[PDB]
């Protein structure tokens, strides 16, 4: 039965394309609000990717925690996060890769997750995160103008869901995205 | 009559400045909605330029087609477009320069146009396009910090018009922009 | 009394960190509206920083003047401003560093200020400004991917205040930001 043989080769092709510098890097930022709703920002791009946003009070519902998820093509050692005491004393970012846990399905890494809670005093949070594709040629700058174009070509998506259950059933599962829910259940699709 | 002689030299000066790396690259994205209104995004910058936007249902009126226009300083071979099936299988962009038609006035190229219709099932579209100035030194990176500054200095403009007629009379013609309307009439001003 | 000795060394450490390429560059754009309110955009980043915004009629109240302020880590000779006659004839920016005045407190530079009024005919203004950190290694591109990440990690803040008095008392003074108010009084905190 060759239907089986061809399918398994095709997954190996997909992995090698994703691990090539033509593979995308994807990042998701989940903001968990006091009313149980979830805001998600997703950005997808080539070479590197990042999100910078202010999560403010909503319809008031307040943000209580954050989960950042990267696709497995990121080099976790390049992950950097900025959070916004006085300006004369601030460091531009922290390298937070060590705080990311591996999300797995069927023994394969489907993503990397950093969850953290916001102190109860907060009514909003300003947050930026950035990561670089893990391909060994990432720090060998293909032409720089190619990376400049990648910045313009990055696509951003923002959605809000009434409850995590609805995020999981109408956003995570149908799109085959990696995720870790409130009960520590893993989601995603192994290649 | 020297009034004539000086005017013709001045147009040649303008062309050479525009074809220099100090010339701008401009891009317009026209979104044609079901109610006959038109949304236009314009960005102008040095070295390279791009737009990334989601065109969603409006006051519901739905987007039906798109026309992207670049100024004649773009290198059409560098044009790249991203459109947003599953993430594990997506290519970061397509090189779409071959689909651009030359817009001309008095036998001179005033712009490049890519028109396409959206499938009727769509209620929205996420779209990004990018192009690099055609000057031969574009891929010889002047210092890279100059291009980084150009990203900050890019100016964006967004307007919506009730009908294409009003776009053409109050936006295209008074600004001397290149355009191709619904009846395939060309607009623009030759140097 | 060693409490005094340690404090003075610590300020020298802060200056050297701020003048290093790990120090931030900060920019503020103040928009002064006809109703006496003030809109402020602040961006903070490593290596270089910029703002690009359109200041439109508000709750109508119209913008009448602009003050741009950079932190003392900027190289004023790299400051560039774009303002938006016809596209075929436009220069991508002007180098405006010579128009910046030094803001000082206790004989020390706390910032650089460019104030200008808008012509009364204007109902809005589109404006972009960019500056590069003054460290001598800024034009020696650390790896370029580091600067690409800095673009993603830049944090933006936008607030509007009812009157300059409230800006000064609830935004400038509590954050120790540099400023020059309507009566030419200087604000800021010297290292």
DSSP notation for C65-78? EEEEEE-TTB-GGG
Three-state DSSP class for B75?
A: coil
The closest alpha carbon to A191, from A111, A133, A100, A135, belongs to: A111
Q: Which residues in chain A touch residue C153, judged by CB atoms under 8 angstroms apart?
A: 50, 52, 80-82, 92-93, 128-130
Q: Name the residue facing C87 among B46, B153, B175 (closest C-beta).
A: B175
Contact at CB, C88 and B145, closer than 8 angstroms? no
User: Does A46 contact B126 at a Cβ distance shorter than 8 Å?
Assistant: no
Burial letters A180-191, b for 16+ CB under 10 A, else e: beeeeeebbbeb
Structure-token pair, residue A184: 């520590």
Q: Please count the structural domains in chain C.
A: 1
Breaks, C-N > 2.5 A, in chain A lie after 59, 84, 141
Q: Contacts of residue B54 in chain A, CB cutoff 8 Å? A: 156-157
CB within 8 A of A111, min separation 6: which ones?
A69, A70, A71, A72, A102, A103, A177, A178, A179, A188
Residues of C with CB under 8 A from a CB of A: 14, 18, 22, 24, 26, 44-46, 71, 143-145, 148-157, 175-177, 189, 191
Contact check, Cβ <8 Å, A149/B139: no
How far is the alpha carbon of C26 from chain A, nearest alpha carbon, in Å?
9
Nearest chain C residue to B153, by CA: C128
Q: Which residues of A touch B144 (CB under 8 A)?
A: 144
Give chain B's length: 191
- Find, in chain A, the residue whose alpha carbon is nearest to that of B138: A145
The reply to whether residue C129 touches residue B149, judged by beta carbons under 8 angstroms, is no
**Residue closest to B94 by CA, chosen among B64, B126, B47, B130:** B130
Give the Cα separation of C45 and C147 in Å (integer). 10
User: Across chain C, which distance is largest between two alpha carbons, in Å?
Assistant: 68
Residue B129 neighbours by CB under 8 Å, 6+ apart? A152, A153, B27, B29, B50, B51, B52, B68, B79, B80, B81, B82, B96
Residue B46: alpha-carbon gap to chain centroid: 14
Q: Please name which of C72, B67, B136, C53 lies closest in space to residue A87, comparing C-alpha atoms.
A: C72
Question: Which three-class secondary structure string do you get for A51-86?
Answer: EEEEECCECCECEEEEEEEECCCECHHHCEEEECCC
Residue C48 placed within a domain: yes
Q: What is the resolution of this structure in A?
A: 1.9
Q: CA A58, CA B155: separation in Å to the nearest integer?
A: 30
This structure was determined by X-ray
Closest Cα in chain C, distance from residue A128 (Å): 5
CB contact under 8 A, C89 and B14: yes
Question: Residue A134: exposed, middle, or buried by beta-carbon count in 10 A (0-12, 13-18, 19+)?
Answer: middle
Query: 3-state class of B189 per DSSP?
Result: coil
What gap in Å lies between CA A182 and CA C52, rounded to an integer?
39
For chain C, the distance separating the N- and C-terminal CA atoms, rounded to the nearest angstrom, is: 20
Tell me which residue of B31, B41, B64, B61 sits closest to B164, measured CA to CA: B31
Task: Identify the H or E element spanning B105.
Answer: strand B101-105
From residue B147, alpha-carbon distances to B128, B152, C8, C44, C56 in Å are: 20, 9, 40, 19, 28
Instruction: Report the alpha-carbon distance of residue A40 to residue B60 in Å, rounded.
Output: 25
Question: Which residues of B fall within a CB distance of 8 Å from A41?
Answer: none
Which residues in B118-182 belong to E strands, given as ranges?
125-132, 155-161, 179-180
**Lookup: tokens for B68:** 């992207």
Record: contact A22-B92, CB cut-off 8 A? yes
Q: Which domain holds residue C80?
A: 2-180
């Amino acid at each position: 039965d060759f239907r089986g043989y061809i399918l398994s080769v095709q997954a190996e092709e997909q992995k090698n394309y994703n691990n090539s510098l033509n593979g995308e890097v994807s990042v998701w930022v989940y903001a968990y609000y006091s009313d149980g709703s979830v805001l998600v920002i997703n950005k997808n791009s080539q070479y590197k990717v990042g999100i910078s946003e202010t999560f403010k009070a909503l319809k008031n519902a307040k943000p209580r925690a954050i989960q950042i998820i990267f696709s497995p093509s990121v080099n976790v050692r390049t992950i950097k996060m900025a959070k916004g005491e006085y300006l004369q004393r601030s460091h531009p970012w922290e390298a937070t890769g060590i705080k990311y846990r591996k999300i797995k399905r069927d023994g394969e890494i489907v993503g990397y997750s950093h969850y953290f809670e916001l102190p109860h005093e907060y009514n909003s949070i300003s947050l930026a995160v950035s990561g670089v594709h893990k391909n060994p040629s990432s720090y060998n700058v293909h032409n720089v103008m190619d990376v400049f174009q990648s910045c313009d070509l990055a696509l951003r998506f923002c959605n809000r869901y009434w409850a995590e259950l609805e995020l999981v059933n109408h956003y995570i599962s149908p799109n085959a995205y990696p995720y870790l829910d409130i009960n520590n259940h893993s989601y995603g699709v192994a290649l």
